Design a protein that fits this description.
Helix content of chain A: over 70%
Number of strands of chain A: 0
Shape of chain A: rod-shaped
Largest interface: A-C, 20 and 20 residues
Order of helices and strands of chain A: H
Oligomer: homohexamer
Amino acid sequence: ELKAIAQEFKAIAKEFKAIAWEFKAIAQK
Amino acid sequence: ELKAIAQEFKAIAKEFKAIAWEFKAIAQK
Amino acid sequence: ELKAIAQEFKAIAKEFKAIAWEFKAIAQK
Amino acid sequence: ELKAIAQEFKAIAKEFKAIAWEFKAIAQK
Amino acid sequence: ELKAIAQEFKAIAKEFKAIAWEFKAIAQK
Amino acid sequence: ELKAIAQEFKAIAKEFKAIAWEFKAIAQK
Protein backbone atom coordinates (compact mmCIF):
# COMPACT_ATOMS: atom_id res chain seq x y z
CA GLU A 1 0.00 0.00 0.00
CA LEU A 2 1.36 3.38 -1.07
CA LYS A 3 -0.90 4.82 1.64
CA ALA A 4 1.13 2.87 4.21
CA ILE A 5 4.41 3.94 2.58
CA ALA A 6 3.33 7.59 2.76
CA GLN A 7 2.45 7.23 6.45
CA GLU A 8 5.76 5.51 7.17
CA PHE A 9 7.76 8.30 5.53
CA LYS A 10 5.76 10.83 7.56
CA ALA A 11 6.84 9.02 10.73
CA ILE A 12 10.44 8.88 9.49
CA ALA A 13 10.39 12.63 8.89
CA LYS A 14 9.16 13.17 12.45
CA GLU A 15 11.92 10.98 13.90
CA PHE A 16 14.65 12.71 11.89
CA LYS A 17 13.27 16.06 13.05
CA ALA A 18 13.80 14.86 16.62
CA ILE A 19 17.26 13.49 15.83
CA ALA A 20 18.22 16.84 14.31
CA TRP A 21 16.99 18.59 17.46
CA GLU A 22 18.99 16.33 19.78
CA PHE A 23 22.21 16.66 17.77
CA LYS A 24 21.66 20.42 17.64
CA ALA A 25 21.52 20.42 21.45
CA ILE A 26 24.60 18.20 21.78
CA ALA A 27 26.52 20.42 19.36
CA GLN A 28 25.50 23.59 21.19
CA LYS A 29 26.49 22.00 24.33
CA GLU B 1 20.29 12.98 24.80
CA LEU B 2 22.09 10.16 23.01
CA LYS B 3 19.49 7.77 24.43
CA ALA B 4 16.81 9.75 22.57
CA ILE B 5 18.85 9.61 19.36
CA ALA B 6 19.28 5.84 19.71
CA GLN B 7 15.54 5.37 20.31
CA GLU B 8 14.68 7.54 17.30
CA PHE B 9 17.02 5.60 15.01
CA LYS B 10 15.45 2.37 16.28
CA ALA B 11 12.05 3.73 15.26
CA ILE B 12 13.45 4.81 11.88
CA ALA B 13 14.83 1.31 11.29
CA LYS B 14 11.40 -0.17 12.02
CA GLU B 15 9.67 2.22 9.60
CA PHE B 16 12.10 1.46 6.78
CA LYS B 17 11.61 -2.26 7.41
CA ALA B 18 7.89 -1.63 6.88
CA ILE B 19 8.54 0.46 3.75
CA ALA B 20 10.72 -2.30 2.30
CA TRP B 21 7.96 -4.82 3.01
CA GLU B 22 5.32 -2.68 1.29
CA PHE B 23 7.41 -2.00 -1.82
CA LYS B 24 8.22 -5.71 -2.00
CA ALA B 25 4.50 -6.48 -1.94
CA ILE B 26 3.87 -3.86 -4.65
CA ALA B 27 6.69 -5.29 -6.76
CA GLN B 28 5.29 -8.82 -6.31
CA LYS B 29 2.03 -7.99 -7.74
CA GLU C 1 31.24 18.56 12.88
CA LEU C 2 28.23 18.00 15.15
CA LYS C 3 26.77 21.38 14.16
CA ALA C 4 26.94 20.34 10.50
CA ILE C 5 25.43 16.93 11.29
CA ALA C 6 22.52 18.62 13.07
CA GLN C 7 21.87 20.83 10.04
CA GLU C 8 22.12 17.90 7.62
CA PHE C 9 19.60 15.89 9.65
CA LYS C 10 17.33 18.95 9.72
CA ALA C 11 17.41 19.11 5.91
CA ILE C 12 16.89 15.34 5.67
CA ALA C 13 13.82 15.61 7.91
CA LYS C 14 12.31 18.28 5.66
CA GLU C 15 13.01 16.18 2.56
CA PHE C 16 11.35 13.07 3.99
CA LYS C 17 8.40 15.28 4.93
CA ALA C 18 8.13 16.30 1.27
CA ILE C 19 8.52 12.70 0.08
CA ALA C 20 5.74 11.60 2.44
CA TRP C 21 3.48 14.27 0.94
CA GLU C 22 4.24 13.19 -2.63
CA PHE C 23 3.50 9.53 -1.86
CA LYS C 24 0.34 10.61 -0.04
CA ALA C 25 -0.70 12.38 -3.25
CA ILE C 26 -0.01 9.26 -5.32
CA ALA C 27 -1.75 7.07 -2.72
CA GLN C 28 -5.03 9.01 -2.88
CA LYS C 29 -5.24 8.86 -6.52
CA GLU D 1 12.64 -1.79 -10.94
CA LEU D 2 10.39 -1.80 -7.88
CA LYS D 3 12.10 -5.03 -6.80
CA ALA D 4 15.40 -3.11 -6.68
CA ILE D 5 13.78 -0.32 -4.65
CA ALA D 6 12.35 -2.85 -2.19
CA GLN D 7 15.74 -4.55 -1.81
CA GLU D 8 17.48 -1.21 -1.27
CA PHE D 9 15.00 -0.16 1.42
CA LYS D 10 15.52 -3.53 3.10
CA ALA D 11 19.25 -2.80 3.19
CA ILE D 12 18.58 0.71 4.52
CA ALA D 13 16.42 -0.72 7.31
CA LYS D 14 19.24 -3.08 8.29
CA GLU D 15 21.80 -0.25 8.38
CA PHE D 16 19.60 1.96 10.55
CA LYS D 17 19.03 -0.98 12.90
CA ALA D 18 22.82 -1.16 13.23
CA ILE D 19 23.11 2.62 13.73
CA ALA D 20 20.47 2.49 16.47
CA TRP D 21 22.38 -0.33 18.16
CA GLU D 22 25.67 1.59 18.05
CA PHE D 23 24.20 4.83 19.41
CA LYS D 24 22.48 2.83 22.15
CA ALA D 25 25.85 1.34 23.10
CA ILE D 26 27.44 4.80 23.09
CA ALA D 27 24.60 6.17 25.22
CA GLN D 28 24.98 3.25 27.66
CA LYS D 29 28.49 3.97 28.40
CA GLU E 1 31.61 2.85 17.59
CA LEU E 2 31.31 6.12 15.69
CA LYS E 3 33.53 4.47 13.07
CA ALA E 4 30.78 1.89 12.52
CA ILE E 5 28.11 4.60 12.46
CA ALA E 6 30.06 6.50 9.80
CA GLN E 7 30.39 3.35 7.68
CA GLU E 8 26.68 2.59 8.07
CA PHE E 9 25.68 6.07 6.91
CA LYS E 10 28.02 5.67 3.92
CA ALA E 11 26.14 2.49 2.99
CA ILE E 12 22.79 4.24 3.50
CA ALA E 13 23.89 7.05 1.17
CA LYS E 14 24.79 4.46 -1.48
CA GLU E 15 21.41 2.73 -1.17
CA PHE E 16 19.48 6.00 -1.40
CA LYS E 17 21.54 6.92 -4.47
CA ALA E 18 20.30 3.69 -6.06
CA ILE E 19 16.71 4.30 -4.92
CA ALA E 20 16.84 7.77 -6.46
CA TRP E 21 18.11 6.26 -9.71
CA GLU E 22 15.33 3.65 -9.86
CA PHE E 23 12.56 6.17 -9.12
CA LYS E 24 14.09 8.50 -11.71
CA ALA E 25 13.78 5.68 -14.26
CA ILE E 26 10.21 4.83 -13.22
CA ALA E 27 9.22 8.50 -13.43
CA GLN E 28 10.81 8.90 -16.87
CA LYS E 29 9.08 5.86 -17.93
CA GLU F 1 4.97 13.27 -8.25
CA LEU F 2 7.44 10.49 -9.03
CA LYS F 3 9.84 12.96 -10.66
CA ALA F 4 9.82 15.02 -7.46
CA ILE F 5 10.30 11.90 -5.32
CA ALA F 6 13.32 10.91 -7.42
CA GLN F 7 14.87 14.36 -6.92
CA GLU F 8 14.15 14.33 -3.18
CA PHE F 9 15.81 10.93 -2.78
CA LYS F 10 18.77 12.23 -4.80
CA ALA F 11 19.17 15.13 -2.36
CA ILE F 12 18.73 12.78 0.61
CA ALA F 13 21.48 10.53 -0.74
CA LYS F 14 23.89 13.47 -1.00
CA GLU F 15 23.02 14.58 2.54
CA PHE F 16 23.64 11.14 4.04
CA LYS F 17 26.94 11.09 2.14
CA ALA F 18 27.88 14.34 3.89
CA ILE F 19 26.72 13.03 7.28
CA ALA F 20 28.82 9.90 6.81
CA TRP F 21 31.86 12.09 6.13
CA GLU F 22 31.26 14.21 9.24
CA PHE F 23 30.93 11.14 11.47
CA LYS F 24 34.04 9.68 9.83
CA ALA F 25 35.86 12.88 10.82
CA ILE F 26 34.63 12.59 14.42
CA ALA F 27 35.44 8.86 14.46
CA GLN F 28 39.10 9.35 13.53
CA LYS F 29 39.68 11.86 16.11
